[PDB]
Design a protein around this ligand. Structure first.
Ligand SMILES: *CCS(=O)(=O)N1CCC[C@@H](C(=O)Nc2ccc(OC(F)(F)F)cc2)C1
Ligand SMILES: *CCS(=O)(=O)N1CCC[C@@H](C(=O)Nc2ccc(OC(F)(F)F)cc2)C1
Ligand SMILES: [Cl-]
Ligand SMILES: [Cl-]
Ligand SMILES: [Cl-]
Ligand SMILES: [Cl-]
Lengths: 95, 147, 97, 147
């Protein structure tokens, strides 16, 4: 067979791209974990996990800062970022 | 045949461990803001990963020594009968570091424990890191498509 | 339709290697990563979702090893590429028109 | 909310694929020549042309020339294009890519195509492909515990 790189088969899922702030709703948690969990609830046991993370990018991209003591932050945005060193399709079908 | 539809083998006895490091407050001398709502995030992830068959192990406001001991321990147990590994950090960060309660830790130290040469029983298996942390001090700005 | 977009959304950053690592080459036919990317584009570019295709590129580059080097410690060494997605939708390059 | 949603790829043109191909460097950079990059550039040109891209290749541009060319492409109309591809075949250092004579921050190059700078690519994919070493560690071979 072929050997693998010791760094293969990692998936790094970040709330934001390097350089940017991440955001939260006042009480119910971060934008990113709320939207990740909603997508896990609806699609986690069927969709390929990177397809699911792409839906999370779309969902978080719809959010905006509604309330902030800094008025320059109002209306500001976030897109998450996932970095894949995966080599195969990843599914969490029911066991 | 190189099969473009090839899936990771996910029919092991166990899904595997989902580790969650949940950081709400920090050592006063770090002058880091409280992460109000992180307990909702931790509980939401616990439910969703449990529903996907993970053994969820949550740790709240660990200090650097405690967090390193715990993650090193998980890296040295057998994952031979597991599909995969998930590790979640809910905290502040700085560059390529994540904050424990008292101090920051290089993210490469944490992922390094699960690389193929350190963690033989996860070779060929997905290692999934999920990091909720700001990664700089710029706010992204809103745009709309032309038309 | 109803929502604004982040100015940084809908980027895809495709790297030959993860941060911190050397990338490799054959030298006649070029880099491991561009050779395997181009082979997958040739076979699957017009049908597969582009991140699905990049995942096949990760698998193909992961199969390679350093066979010849003046540094003998480099023999058998390895590379995995890395793609970073801020995409919000599926990306296909179906034939135009 | 449709989980199978695809980018709109039915515009008149696929769009531009920009390729910055760097084989040799200003002698005072002490950077090794990139023997084989010619093969990579030609291979990409064929594959992207076959996918409908207008491929525009530039060999061994100096920093000023590279910035002028990429700024030009960021300020033309992509209203009738599906997407944008940009390829760098060069050496890098941290979050920099090398032109012939000097390094350039990758964020300056991607930044030109952000939605607030490039209105006609808003809602469209921007794809950056970078063939460059990203440090001085060789990854090591491992085998799954199963075999
Ligand atoms: C109104 C303040 S803001 O929106 O301009 N912004 C300032 C920069 C930091 C941002 C922030 O607080 N981010 C954040 C903190 C904690 C998080 O986790 C959570 F607490 F669990 F939700 C997520 C995001 C705010
Ligand atoms: C035997 C030398 S090695 O394989 O250990 N290795 C040392 C570190 C750098 C590696 C290398 O040359 N990588 C590389 C150079 C140039 C590239 O572009 C290309 F020339 F177009 F292919 C790709 C990869 C060698
Ligand atoms: Cl998707
Ligand atoms: Cl963002
Ligand atoms: Cl800002
Ligand atoms: Cl091994």
């Amino acid at each position: 067979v072929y050997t693998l790189p010791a760094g293969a088969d990692f998936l790094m899922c970040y709330s934001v791209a390097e350089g940017y702030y991440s955001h939260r709703e006042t009480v119910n948690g971060s934008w990113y974990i709320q939207d990740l969990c909603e997508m896990l609830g609806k699609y986690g046991s069927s969709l390929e996990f990177t397809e699911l993370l792409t839906l999370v990018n779309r969902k978080v991209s719809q959010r905006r800062v509604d309330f902030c003591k800094d008025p320059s932050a109002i209306g500001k945005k976030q897109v998450p970022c996932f970095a894949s060193m995966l080599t195969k399709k990843l599914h969490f079908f029911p066991k | 045949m190189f099969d473009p539809a090839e899936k990771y083998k996910m029919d092991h006895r166990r899904r595997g461990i989902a580790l969650i490091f949940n950081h709400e407050r920090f050592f006063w001398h770090l002058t880091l803001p409280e992460r109000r709502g992180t307990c909702a995030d931790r509980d939401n992830l616990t439910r969703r990963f449990s529903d996907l068959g993970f053994e969820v192990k949550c740790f709240n406001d660990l200090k650097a020594e405690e967090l390193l001991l715990k993650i090193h321990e998980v890296s040295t147990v057998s994952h031979a009968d597991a599909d995969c590994f998930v590790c979640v950090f809910l905290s502040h960060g700085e560059g390529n570091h994540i904050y424990a309660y008292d101090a920051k830790i290089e993210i490469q130290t944490l992922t390094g424990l699960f690389k193929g040469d350190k963690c033989h029983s996860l070779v060929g298996k997905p290692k999934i890191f999920i990091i909720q942390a700001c990664r700089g001090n710029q706010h992204d700005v809103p745009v709309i498509p032309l038309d």
